[PDB]
Structure formats: structure tokens, C-alpha cells
Amino acid sequence: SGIVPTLQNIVATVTLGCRLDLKTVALHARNAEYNPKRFAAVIMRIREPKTTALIFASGKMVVTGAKSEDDSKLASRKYARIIQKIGFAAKFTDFKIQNIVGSCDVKFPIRLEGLAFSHGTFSSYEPELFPGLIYRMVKPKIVLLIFVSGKIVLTGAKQREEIYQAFEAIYPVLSEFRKM
DNA sequence: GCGCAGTTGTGCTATGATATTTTACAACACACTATTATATACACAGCGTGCTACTGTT
């Protein structure tokens, strides 16, 4: 082994606590998009940490694109400050990470059909529909996308340890189904 | 109201044997999904660039 998964995307939610006028928000923000007809939220962005926020009239906000939990909270506080600077009585509350995505490379090809047959109740593999095997782990409850190349995607985690836990649990199985 | 003469209507049509063949429309309420990110990869469609051929001019 020796491989440890790399975090790729962190999704979080934040309650600003006050109602927002989206045209005002979009108008005053330096990096905003807002087309009511397409989606009901201002799509705001900041350069550091590089992230994207979906800002709603209710004052709720979704922050995505961060590569670390630190970066997620940091960028979230920053978006909240922007809203304040524009003039609303916003508050940075209820910061919570909802989804963590990770990925790695085991460095060997995998026999997906064998794995799907062996771990049938957790696996779903339809190569004509999507080339990767969808593995639904029980403990921890994580979803893994397994590819012939040996590249692995882990998602559905609320905490970093779950990403790490799942990979540790899957590695022996990937080894059992290697090609070379 | 009674009798008579049409029409309808109702049973059955030999004994045993052997061999195959399949009600509508409108309104209201409740449930479900676009949007944004991330690794992943196979696929398909379009766009751009390069090469070859044909036509025109010297």
C-alpha cells in the first residue's frame, strides 16, 4: 500500500440568518452571476481560496470547490463578509460540511466484472452505461467509483476519516482483482 | 269471454372402439428535481486545420 487518498472537493452549507435581495447582491459583488430564469441563486466566486458559492434569498448559502476543510470554512467566512459589506445583517452561522470527495491511484488494472460478481450486493456495473463500477460500502457508508485503470473515486463522506477508512477497506479487494 | 287457428318454441336425433393436435375536463395539491463542485472515463459530435486537387492566369 502506501497510498492515501487526495481530497478533491468539499461542499458546505452556511446560514446567513437574514433575507437577501439577490439583484442587489449580484450587482454589488465583484464576481457574481444571477439569471433568475435559469437558477434561483446568485453564483458568487472568490479567488482565494478558489471556490464558488450559491447564495439564496432565504439567506442560506452553499459553498463548493474547496480542496480542504480549512479552505471551506475560510472561503465561507469570506463570502459572509462580502454579504455584510454589501449591507445586510448577515451572520456566519451553522457552518457544516455535507460532502467530501477523494481520489487515488492503486497503480494496477482491475477486473471489474470479477469484482462485481464477487461483491454483487454492494456493486453495480453496467460498462455500456458508465465505465466504472459503483461500490456502495456499508461501514463506513461511502460510495466508490472503481475504474479498470486503477483510478478510484470515494464520495458521500461527512468526515475525512471516512474517505481514509473506505480506501483501507477496499484496497485488499482491489488487490484480489488485479490484472498485473 | 271463450274457442279455435294460426304462430312460435322445444326436446331429441345407433352401439362400442381407437389413433393425434394445443364520463370527461379542470383545478388543486403534493412530490420531485434544476444548479454548483470533484475526481473518474468512455463516446459522440462538431470545429478547425492541413493537404490535395483543380482552375485560372501569366
Q: Is the dihedral of CA A101, A106, A109, A111 positive or negative?
A: negative
Rounded CA–C1' distance between A99 and B36, in angstroms: 13
Residue A150 CB-density burial (10 A; 0-12 exposed, 13-18 middle, 19+ buried): middle
- Whole-angstrom Cα distance, residue A124 to residue A21? 45
* The Cα angle at residue A106 between residues A120 and A147, in degrees rounded to 5: 45
Residue–nucleotide distance: A56 CA to B27 C1' (Å): 31
Residue A115 and residue A177 in contact, taking contact as beta carbons nearer than 8 Å: yes
**CB neighbourhood size of A1 (10 A):** 9
Indicate the residue type of A43.
I
The experimental resolution of this structure, in angstroms, equals 7.8
* Alpha carbon distance A93, A136 (integer Å): 32
Q: Count of residues for chain A?
A: 180
Can you tell me the distance from the alpha carbon of A23 to that of A57, in angstroms, rounded to the nearest whole number?
10
Question: What phi and psi, each to the nearest 5 degrees, are found at residue A150?
Answer: 100, 0
DSSP string, chain A: ----PEEEEEEEEEE--S---HHHHHHHSSSEE--TTT-SSEEEEETTTTEEEEE-TTSEEEEEEESSHHHHHHHHHHHHHHHHHHT-----EEEEEEEEEEEEE-SS-B-HHHHHHHTTTTEE--TTT-SSEEEE-SSS--EEEE-TTSEEEEEEESSHHHHHHHHHHHHHHHHHTB--
Show me where chain A is broken: residue before each gap, C-N > 2.5 A. Answer: none
Does the C-beta of A64 come within 7 A of strand B? yes
A145 touches strand B (CB under 7 A): yes
Judge whether residue A54 contacts strand B, using its CB and a 7 Å cut-off: yes
Output the distance from A39 CA to B26 C1' rounded to whole Å. 30
Sequence-distant (≥ 6) Cβ neighbours of residue A168 within 8 angstroms: none
CB-based contact A105:A3 (threshold 8 Å): yes
In this structure, the number of other CB atoms found within 10 A of the CB of residue A99 comes to 14
Task: Find the Å distance, CA of residue A102 to C1' of nucleotide B2.
Answer: 110
Q: Which nucleotide is nearest to A65 (CA to C1')?
A: B37
Q: Is the CB of A5 under 7 A from strand B?
A: no
Answer yes or no: are the C-beta atoms of A95 and A14 closer than 8 Å.
yes
Q: Which nucleotide is nearest to A53 (CA to C1')?
A: B36
The C-alpha torsion from A162 through A163 and A168 to A174, rounded to 10°, is 130
C-alpha span between A136 and A125 (Å, rounded):
12
Q: What single-letter amino acid sits at A50?
A: K
CA–CA distances in Å: residue A126 to residues A15, A46, A134, A151: 40, 39, 9, 17
